[PDB]
């Protein structure tokens, strides 16, 4: 309908207020000092998740302007959240600080573009500093510590992550499932993961993550793309009879014919998924073979001349469950044959040795590795189902963070890195004063999140911040200890990536907010 | 329903007020001095685009009269915006100044027709002056500068435009795509562009521009027009199975049979597009052949006796993506065959030499050129996806402006041309006094936009304007420098066309507004 | 009564609103092209005026808080007119300027105390600059030039002033009275003047000028503090029998019974005015003697056992006329004994010769100066009573302008001196940035008067200000002729004292108001 | 009290509305075909009138701002009638016209100060043009023609005016009184007139015309400023004993105790009127002498040690009648001593001969003109008291129209 438009400060104020409200709840929650937040649910009794984000998610602003402004922060934060796996709150906190200052500058009537530029400039510098600052992740003990951080003092989660990580291998993928019982169960499972996208978001399953999980999926592998439904159809009919969800692997699943029917026709009355077959060329075929063996299903190729229509259900393999995400598709456990799987691995392994070339070796080795690695499953127990779900969610979050953290390496947590970088940053200047202030603002923003933790502590963040800044190297404040010590030595480290991601996003948001002269809303 | 009608000044005032509101937001934004504007979105967090227009777009007036009046300006401005590629704001600014004065004249009770005539007369004179004034665009360095202007101090965009422009060639078309990653990628791609319209706006794709982009379009080329669906249909069915969007090239696509089904029946459940085959006569056929080779598809002709029905999907070529606009249709990249494409070019090239006649040579050379030129693709990276989109939009705008600017040649920016012309204009007189005042009004209007920039500077526009006027030749004020220098030497130049376009449209709008005695609204 | 209390920005917006009503009403009258202001009167037809002091006197607001803001600025600004004989409207314009931008900065989070320190510094330096810019006015030629300028270019008024000042000293006491005919008269007479105003404003007599004239009054000298009428009734009765008015010069009159009756009761039956004796301590007694001998009366001192109960008419002194105002009492023609007066002057002259300290000598000769100085009475003659009365007003005005001019010289009028000194102070800085914006706030405020003046001229104030600032020395804009030039040569100047008082008082309230955190008023 | 403040165009529309009500009400009566206006009265039945001045007098608006607009135009326009004896309605009509279009231009963004300068110029030139267009009215034939025209074509009224003016000068003082019968009477009498009106409007007597008539009043001449009643009570008592009204000609009467009591208290017990002495400075004193000798009274001057406390009735002068208005006092029949009056006129006549400057001579002869001029009294006779009263009004009107005509033509 008609839209109400505001411009200038008036627009800004609304956004600012909205931002603060969202930020405030988040800020307190963030940090181990803060307590877990529960989100009220209209649907049922509130769900308790240890997410800064969740608070934000719940929070809606009645005021459209404020709400919209609030929304902006959240969306960006989530984006950071996804990539980093953590630091949703941090970005939010950072954004708020930046925005407020930026707004003030706007109040000043300095030209905001420069501020943004300065902020961007500062951010870039900070990022560089952070990268240098970052130090490689420590051993599993560190990993547990990393896990704990994601845990927010969930020791078990960290332990589970470490334990799972050790057995599977850090590289090896770990999957989380609801626990059978109170006691957690860690079982290694056979399976392979190949990075393949899901053809359409439509395919994307119920859960919020958007990864699709199929229960007892049926796997059809075709080297050939499926041009038309019709050939596929007779396969589908059998599948339908089984009623088990169908997962399709094709070199390409032709979108409209299959997908249009699948999505529109198949609500989830039937379940279907499609993924591109991993790899390309012979390797792709080889990969398919590896997959096929693991599944225990068979693959049909034109070259073979096997017909999809001819192929029965039996040809299709089955998986205990499959999870698909945009980046990757994995099969948690193909039923497979134990002997069959092993034999294939050996055969591939032999091939790897056989090939003189590195290239051949690499492909083969990669192929074996996927099968060999298998998948690890973690069960989270809980006193109650509700708890288990909550725990599970936390565990999952911890796992992505840990995995990210290890690869990236760890940097001092507590926003120590942020503060540390800022000091260096301060020296750096912007082209013009307006830029300069923006740069300073960014630096100020970085400092803030450290303070917030301190505030939760109840210690005066000023002193802590000052002290922290004074210390060279990794100098930081440990909330739990409430003692000064090396962050690394303490072993409380925030992932470089997460920190970097959050900062950049927040800066982006802040810059955007500052720029936005005008807001428009519906009446 | 019932309409509320106003007449006379009362109508005028409403329009005027509405105009001012829209104008005011735009005016401030316009100019590098101004800051980028963000539009609030109900849908989601606000989108930041560097568009004067966007502010206008967002702005709606609650008052119907005001709103309608506001609307009038916007629509015209956009029209100017499209043609010029830039200067949306300028037109708006110009219009507002003109309208207000005109309204005042109306208040005066001078007969407004004459004013309009004078304004038109003044405009014409101004245009002539501008054309003479304009000086050919400078080299790529200038181009970058031109790009920067579109950039609004986006150095990268200007660089990208220049870089893309250099490689492709100014004449060569450049296409923009979202960046794969943060770093921009510029890749030359094979492809040909032929200026063909889209048969129906219905075909027009989702995006606002209305250019239709198809992903992996399938190309069917027929020399023959497709009389009826039926022959086409079997082709379509295959296409549907692929599910890949279908692009159709026909000498004429018979509108109702194909299009009625396509538009109505094919929502975008399937995607189809139709374009007329480029050229006519043998040349058209030749062009088709060139296209066909590039696509890698084949063309079916009655003369050949190949049947559309007979023709399979294979006959149809594929394109990585196709973009269509009303003026032109382009294929970003036909898969083509590298050898095949090259061979054809050579063959055509040989033909060009072979033909004695210029005419034959020209056609052949044109044909080769399209294939030879290929298309250039620019990827815009961004820290965040949102940024990338914003950046991309800016880039696109810059590119049209730059392209337009180069051909037209550049004139001093800063509204220097406008002010300069006006002084000359002032001497010119109108038939009658009422006309005279209108002429003066137009001149006044031209001056204003210079002032606005100055105002953003905070320098008193009066002095600047006076100073600017005093200087002969290209004398202007550089906002960034805040120093007086030659506009050309400064290298900050606004395209002649954009300036001309904006002025004319604004004048048209202003004239229309002045004339409009009465407004009517719904109750 | 229950109060309504406001803090911070809430009290801020309130005061700003009250100040803007007062300032905007008063400033329309500023400059040669000042507009009129209509002040309603229940007494009959409205009054159309351009006297900014009259307008201010009528300003009272409904909102208790806003009214507090207005009454504050009115009280301080009035002190300027009292001190320099002019400056109130300029003081109001400046005050509004400093307060407007000051509070903006405060609301921007800047430190109120710092802001005030900066404002205060700029004013200190600026006053120094005005002192430097001042053109002296000492020689009789200068005195006359200033006089005629003030008397609207009346050579005769300038002559009168110069003649009077020459015949009684530049710092001598000069009065203006009605003429006895066509010719002007000037005669020094036995009189005196001391800085002591009326005890009650309710003593104001016919002179609308806020003064009190008493023809042939009886001077009552009592160094006692009269709080009760009882011991004074006999005197009052005797005075009443004489029908002559009375002037009570006592140590102090307390509003218990005396000042109570003298005002509340004597509203027509008698004409009684009361003032405090000059000085304090022993000097108070000595001075009363001087006044006593001068008026031929005797002082009633309890020390000598003098009883007011027995104070007969012979004890009371007398003078041809006495004029008392806010802070001054002037005894125009003492009926003292020439020889007695000469005797005292000699007696004190001797005391000076045998003085043992600078302080003694100074005060001693200040007393002889008063007695031996006399009063210069100007009798304004004319052809008609109307002319006589009008000229008399001009003489009174020119006299107060010239006296201010002899004291601190003269400076470029038209709001040019303030904008001049301000352009010099562009490099001035303070202990910190807040203090710096404080300095800028004051400098920008110094341009308000000229810009207002030019505004009433229908001209562009930012253009004229920009031009005047770019000039040097007493170069400015003559709003009368609307041409630039040398303000002093163009005869457009103000006594440096009024420009100074205006700025200082303006900065005073502006400072207090900017450092006010809470407002209390009745509900 | 808390105020309501308006600026620019807001104050503009307000004043324009108040002016339009006033002007539109008053202008309906303009011309020979002017319409009537009904003015309500609580006193009884409404008054139907065509007198635009009466209508204006009743105009007061509810909106404080609009009322300010109306009261402004009413105050200035009234000055026209006071000055020329007519012009108020025309002044209102013109004012409304100039203000209507003026404010339109102002609202159109034109400079108010410039607009006013232009208006002022056109008026300067136009007044010059009117002066050129003017047909003189000096000869007795002309005087009579204008007189009868003003008296609704009454040849007798024109004759009266012309006769009076001839017998006392065109700029001489002429009064109109009730006749003693059928025949008109005209007789020059010892009198004088000076430009000084009543101090308080509350002194208005029976004459609804905004004037005050006093039969056989006692003239009190005091060059002092009387602010308190104390030192005047004895005189007032004596005057009261005489039952005759009183005219106080002083330097100025201050509203502290004197003007206060003289008005607020003397609302029926006595008939007292007060006016300022003519001129200023030394001339003020001289003129008071002229008035003194003329009325046969003496001036109380503090300079001579004169005390109002001892001012007896013999000090007070007397006249057959005295008429005071907004800005004029006319002493119709001074009980002065013929020879004394002639003596003064001669004394001043001598002073003129030995004058040493134009200014002295001028003012000196202005004084002898007043004393030696006398007052021409017209007695309007008729067949019935009604006719007499109606004709008298016509004579008063025609007299004021003719005097204006002799001064600047027609
Ligand atoms: N004992 C500790 N001392 C210092 N800081 C700590 C300590 N333990 C954790 N932190 C810090 O607290 C922050 C992690 O908390 P949290 O995960 O709530 O923040 P977040 O990741 O931004 O919010 P969310 O997880 O909701 O996105 C990190 O900066 C982390 O280093
Ligand atoms: N440094 C500069 N000095 C002078 N003017 C400048 C400078 N850089 C750009 N400009 C001017 O600013 C204007 C371009 O800004 P902008 O693109 O916002 O205006 P617009 O094209 O009318 O608005 P929109 O792009 O929203 O349609 C041109 O007149 C351009 O010459
Ligand atoms: Mg976290
Ligand atoms: Mg542009």
Contact D109 B104 (CB under 8 A): yes
Looking only at the bridges linking them, the beta strands covering A3-6 and A519-522 are: antiparallel
Ligand nearest to the CA of B36: 2
Q: Are C233 and C207 in contact (CB under 8 A)?
A: no
**Do residues C331 and C188 lie in contact, with contact meaning Cβ atoms separated by under 8 Å?**
no
Burial class (CB in 10 A: 0-12, 13-18, 19+), A234: middle
The residue contributing the CA closest to ligand 2 atom 26 is B52
CA proximity to A502, closest of A41, A156, A20, A96: A96
The answer to whether D224 faces chain C, any CB pair under 8 Å, is no
Contact partners, residue B513, CB within 8 Å, separation at least 6: B12, B15, B16, B19, B69, B72, B73, B95, B99, B102, B103
What does the DSSP 8-state code read for residue C160? H
CA D37 to chain C, closest CA, distance in angstroms equals 24
> How close, in Å, is residue C173 to chain A by CA atoms?
54
Closest approach of chain C CAs to the CA of D287, in angstroms? 13
Neighbours of chain B (3+ CB pairs under 8 A): A, C, D
CB contact under 8 A, C62 and D284: no
D109 interaction partners in chain B (CB closer than 8 Å): 104
Q: Which of C101, C107, C108 to mutate to test the interface with A (most CBs of A within 10 A)?
A: C108
| Residue in chain D lying closest to B105 (CA) | D108
Task: Please report how many Cα atoms fall inside a 13 Å half-sphere around the Cα of residue D29, on the Cβ side.
Answer: 20
Give the ligand whose atoms come closest to the C-alpha of residue A153.
1
* Residue of B460, B461, B464, B466 to mutate, testing the C interface (most C Cβ within 10 Å of its Cβ): B460
Solved with: cryo-EM
Please answer whether residues D319 and D219 qualify as being in contact, where contact means their C-beta atoms are separated by less than 8 angstroms: yes
* Chains within contact range of chain A (3+ C-beta pairs < 8 Å): B, C
Handedness of CA D204, D205, D211, D215 (dihedral sign): negative
Q: Whose CA is nearest to atom 14 of ligand 2?
A: B31
Å from A15 to nearest chain B CA? 10
For D230, other C-beta atoms within 10 Å of its C-beta total 17
* Residue A135: burial class (beta carbons within 10 Å; 0-12, 13-18, 19+): middle
Helix (H) or strand (E) holding D226: strand D218-226
- Ligand 1 centroid – CA C35 distance (Å): 67
DSSP secondary structure, C134-145, as one string: PBP--SHHHHHH
Q: Could you please report the per-residue DSSP string of C42-98?
A: TTSS-EEE--HHHHHHT---SSHHHHHHHHHHHHHHHHHHHHHS--HHHHHHHHHHH
Residues in chain B: 523
Q: A467 CA distance to ligand 1 centroid (A)?
A: 19
B154 lines ligand 2 (CB under 6 A): no
Burial class for B523, CB neighbours closer than 10 Å (0-12, 13-18, 19+): exposed
Query: Using an 8 Å Cβ cutoff, are C398 and C211 in contact?
Result: no
**Cα C168 versus chain centre, distance:** 21
Do residues C260 and C230 lie in contact, with contact meaning Cβ atoms separated by under 8 Å? no
Q: How many CB atoms lie within 10 A of CB B201?
A: 10
Neighbours of A330 (CB within 10 A): 23
Q: Which atom of ligand 2 sits closest to the CA of residue B54?
A: 26
List phi, psi (to 5°) of C345: -55, -40
Q: By CB neighbour count within 10 A (0-12 exposed, 13-18 middle, 19+ buried), where does C132 fall?
A: exposed
Nearest CB among A2, A260, A520 relative to B40 is that of A520
Beta strand pairing call for D299-300 and D218-226: parallel
What phi, psi does A333 have (nearest 5°)?
-150, 110
Element (H, E) at B93: helix B88-108
The answer to whether the annotation marks B512 as part of a ligand binding site is: no
For B138, half-sphere exposure in the C-beta direction (CA atoms, 13 angstrom radius) is 17
Question: Is the distance from CB of C495 to CB of C405 less than 8 angstroms?
Answer: yes
Check if the beta carbon of residue C392 is closer than 8 Å to that of residue C160. Answer: no
Q: Ligand 4 centre and the CA of A431: distance in Å?
A: 24
Phi, psi of B134 (to 5 degrees): -60, 145
| Alpha carbons A191 and A195: distance in angstroms, whole number | 13
Q: Which of A378, A402, A444, A405 is nearest to A175 (CA)?
A: A378
Contact in structure between B110 and B434 (CB atoms under 8 Å) = yes
Q: Across the interface, do A108 and C108 touch by the CB < 8 Å criterion?
A: yes
Distance between Cα A107 and ligand 2 center (Å): 24
Around Cβ C138, how many Cβ atoms within 10 Å?
11
- DSSP states along C434-456: HHHHHHHHHHHHTTHHHHHHHHH
Residue count (chain C)? 523
Is the beta carbon of B435 within 6 A of some atom in ligand 2? no
* B235-to-B204, B218, B221, B272, B275 alpha-carbon distances in Å: 22, 11, 12, 12, 17
How many Å lie between the centroid of ligand 2 and the Cα of residue B149?
Answer: 6
Q: Is C299 helix (H, G, I), strand (E, B) or coil?
A: strand
How far is residue A331's CA from residue A377's CA, in Å, rounded to a whole number? 11
What residue's CA is closest to ligand 1, atom 14?
A31
Residues of A within the annotated binding site for ATP? 29-32, 50, 86-90, 414, 478-480, 494
Which bin fits C8, alpha (ψ -120 to 50), beta or left (φ > 0)?
A: left
How many residues can be counted in chain A? Answer: 523
Alpha helices in A374-495 (DSSP H): 385-408, 416-427, 433-457, 461-470, 487-490
Phi, psi of B32 (to 5 degrees): -65, -25
Distance CA C213, CA A261 (A): 108
| Nearest-5° Cα angle at A156, A152 to A159 | 105
Strand ranges (E), B251-400: 272-276, 299-300, 317-318, 321-324, 329-331, 375-380
Q: How far is CA A418 from the centre of its chain?
A: 21
Window D:280-299, CB contacts with B under 8 Å = none
Count CB-CB contacts under 10 A for residue A195: 11
Cβ–Cβ below 8 Å for B62 and A228:
no
Name the DSSP class of D310. G
Element (H, E) at A412: strand A410-412
| Residue minimizing CA distance to atom 31 of ligand 1 | A413
Instruction: Confirm or reject contact between A433 and chain C (CB < 8 A).
Output: no
| Of C127, C236, C36, residue with least CA distance to C499 | C127
Strands B246-250 and B272-276: parallel
Residue A41 φ then ψ, to 5°: -125, 135
Cα separation of the two ends of chain A: 7
B232 token code pair: 């086409």
Instruction: Write the CB contacts of C22 (distance below 8 Å, at least 6 apart in sequence).
Output: C56, C59, C69, C70, C73, C74, C92, C96
Query: Taking CB atoms and an 8 Å limit, are C109 and A108 in contact across chains?
Result: no
Å from A99 to nearest chain B CA?
14
Q: Is the dihedral of CA B259, B261, B267, B273 positive or negative?
A: negative
Cα–Cα distance measured from residue B144 to residue B162, given in angstroms and rounded to the nearest whole number: 5
Residue D53: phi and psi, rounded to 5, are -70, -40
CA distance C401 to B42: 66
Q: Element (H or E) spanning B41, and its range?
A: none
Classify burial at A210, counting beta carbons within 10 Å of its beta carbon; exposed 0-12, middle 13-18, buried 19 or more: middle
Q: Which residues sit directly before a break in chain C (C to N > 2.5 Å)?
A: none
Q: Which of A89, A151, A402, A411 to mutate to test the pocket of ligand 1 (most atoms within 8 A of CB)?
A: A89
Enter the tokens of residue D198: 């009543």
Q: Buried b / exposed e across C151-184, counting CB within 10 Å, b at 16+?
A: beebebbbbbbbbbbeebebebbbbbbebbbbeb
Contact list in D for residue C179 (CB cut-off 8 A) is 280-281
DSSP 8-state code for residue A62 = S
Q: How far is the CA of A89 from the centre of ligand 3 (A)?
A: 7
A 10 A CB-CB count for B309 gives 13
Contacts of C407 (CB under 8 A, 6+ apart): C171, C495, C497
Q: What is the largest CA-CA distance in chain C?
A: 73
Q: Which residue has the tokens 């204009």?
A: B425
């Amino acid at each position: 309908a008609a839209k109400d438009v505001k411009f200038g400060n008036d627009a800004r104020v609304k956004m600012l207020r909205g931002v603060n409200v969202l930020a405030d709840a988040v800020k307190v929650t963030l940090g181990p000092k803060g307590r877990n937040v529960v989100l009220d649910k209209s649907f049922g009794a509130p769900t308790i998740t240890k997410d800064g984000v969740s608070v934000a998610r719940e929070i809606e602003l009645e005021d459209k302007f404020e709400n919209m402004g609030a929304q902006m922060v959240k969306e960006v934060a989530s984006k950071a959240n996804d990539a980093a796996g953590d630091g949703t709150t941090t970005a939010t906190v950072l954004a708020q600080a930046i925005i407020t200052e930026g707004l003030k500058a706007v109040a000043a009537g300095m030209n905001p573009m420069d501020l943004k530029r300065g902020i961007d400039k500062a951010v870039t510098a900070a990022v560089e500093e952070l990268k240098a600052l970052s130090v490689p992740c420590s051993d599993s003990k560190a990993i547990a510590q990393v896990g704990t951080i994601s845990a927010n003092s969930d020791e078990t989660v960290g332990k589970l992550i470490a334990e799972a990580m050790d057995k599977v291998g850090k590289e090896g993928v770990i999957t989380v499932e609801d626990g059978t019982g109170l006691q957690d169960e860690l079982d290694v499972v056979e399976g392979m993961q190949f990075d393949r996208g899901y053809l359409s978001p439509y395919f994307i399953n119920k859960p919020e993550t958007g990864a699709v999980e199929l229960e007892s999926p049926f796997i059809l592998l075709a080297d050939k793309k499926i041009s038309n439904i019709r050939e596929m159809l007779p396969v589908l009919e059998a599948v339908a009879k089984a009623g088990k969800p169908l997962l399709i692997i094709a070199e390409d699943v032709e979108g409209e014919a299959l997908a249009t029917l699948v999505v529109n026709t198949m609500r989830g009355i039937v379940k279907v998924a499609a993924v591109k077959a991993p790899g390309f060329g012979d390797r792709r075929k080889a990969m398919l073979q590896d997959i096929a063996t693991l599944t225990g299903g068979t693959v049909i190729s034109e070259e073979i001349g096997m017909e999809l229509e001819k192929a029965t259900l039996e040809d299709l393999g089955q998986a205990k469950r499959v999870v698909i995400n945009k980046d990757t598709t994995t099969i948690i456990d193909g039923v497979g044959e134990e002997a069959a799987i092993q034999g294939r691995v050996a055969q591939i392994r032999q091939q790897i040795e056989e090939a003189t070339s590195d290239y051949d070796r690499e492909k083969l080795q990669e192929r074996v590795a996927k099968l060999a690695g298998g998948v690890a499953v973690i069960k989270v127990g809980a006193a109650t189902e509700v708890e288990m779900k909550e725990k599970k969610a936390r565990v999952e979050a911890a796992l992505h963070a840990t995995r990210a953290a290890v690869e990236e390496g760890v940097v001092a947590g507590g926003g120590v890195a942020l503060i540390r970088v800022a000091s260096k940053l301060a020296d750096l200047r912007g082209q013009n004063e307006d830029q300069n202030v923006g740069i300073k603002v960014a630096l100020r923003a970085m400092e803030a999140p450290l303070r917030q933790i301190v505030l939760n502590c109840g210690e005066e963040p000023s002193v802590v911040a000052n002290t922290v800044k004074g210390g060279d190297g990794n100098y930081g404040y440990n909330a739990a200890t409430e003692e000064y010590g090396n962050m690394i030595d303490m072993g409380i480290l925030d992932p470089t990536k997460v920190t970097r991601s959050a900062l950049q996003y927040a800066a982006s948001v802040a810059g955007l907010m500052i720029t936005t002269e005008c807001m428009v809303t519906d009446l």
